[PDB]
Design a protein around this ligand. Structure first.
Ligand SMILES: Cc1cc(N)ccc1C(=O)N[C@H]1CCC(=O)NC1=O
Ligand SMILES: Cc1cc(N)ccc1C(=O)N[C@H]1CCC(=O)NC1=O
Ligand SMILES: [Zn+2]
Ligand SMILES: [Zn+2]
Ligand SMILES: [Zn+2]
Lengths: 105, 104, 57
């Protein structure tokens, strides 16, 4: 019973039970076109976020998925991205590990 | 999909250059210091600096000698170059979490 | 060459021992890693190879 909370405001976001091994690992170190590097943990589900914009396929780290920016729905901190439009799974979250705090349910 | 050094962005390898050694490009191995590594095998890499002389001692890959591979830019230890074997003669075993994957 | 739990590094088995002997498991048989409780296989010990790591003795 471990949960991940927004490090800025404490809202519960996801659960350790929901870690998802995308391509063999739940941890992906990635860089965007601006050269910013993120350590992303993949989760099946989340709550308490606000997904902003329409999904985009441009520069997706995960082939066959479109992404949307995920903010903490409470404080607006950028916590990662939601991925959709794929298969097995259809949808999942890539959340920035350093912006989360893990603790007891 | 390009692999860069996670510490500095040096260009290192490509997803196209992954090599399934023994049926898998990923090997999970431990050294005699008890460190566990998820090693990805690549046919080719660039931007590294190979340090020292090859050694067969404790090689995870039978028939190959290894040389330490640093990031040629920042000096971070990214893995090993393997040589002296067959099919292939040489390849790179890089530590997955010391790389960052992203756009070409 | 020694087989260890990939998740926590518990020693499980070796090259010399589908295994005939293992250590460090808890049989529930479903074989859990005794240390971290990862499902590593069943008891003949059958172990998920992808759930192991290999190194020197
Ligand atoms: C595409 C992009 C352009 C910018 N000017 C700044 C940032 C980004 C960015 O992080 N995009 C991310 C979105 C999620 C993903 O999968 N891949 C990406 O590169
Ligand atoms: C051989 C060795 C001795 C130490 N004192 C510390 C670390 C290491 C080490 O990582 N060696 C690696 C080199 C690459 C290989 O294939 N197998 C290994 O165990
Ligand atoms: Zn928040
Ligand atoms: Zn570097
Ligand atoms: Zn374990």
């Amino acid at each position: 019973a471990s949960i991940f909370r927004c490090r800025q405001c404490g809202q519960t976001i996801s659960r350790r039970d929901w870690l998802l091994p995308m391509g063999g690992d739940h941890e992906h170190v990635v860089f965007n076109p601006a050269g910013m590097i993120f350590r992303v943990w993949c989760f099946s589900l989340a709550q308490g976020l606000r997904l902003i914009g329409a999904p985009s396929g441009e520069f997706s780290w995960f082939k066959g998925y479109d992404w949307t920016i995920a903010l903490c729905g409470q404080c607006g901190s950028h916590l990662g991205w939601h991925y959709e439009g794929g298969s097995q799974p259809q949808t999942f979250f890539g959340l920035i590990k350093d912006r989360l705090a893990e603790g007891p349910a």
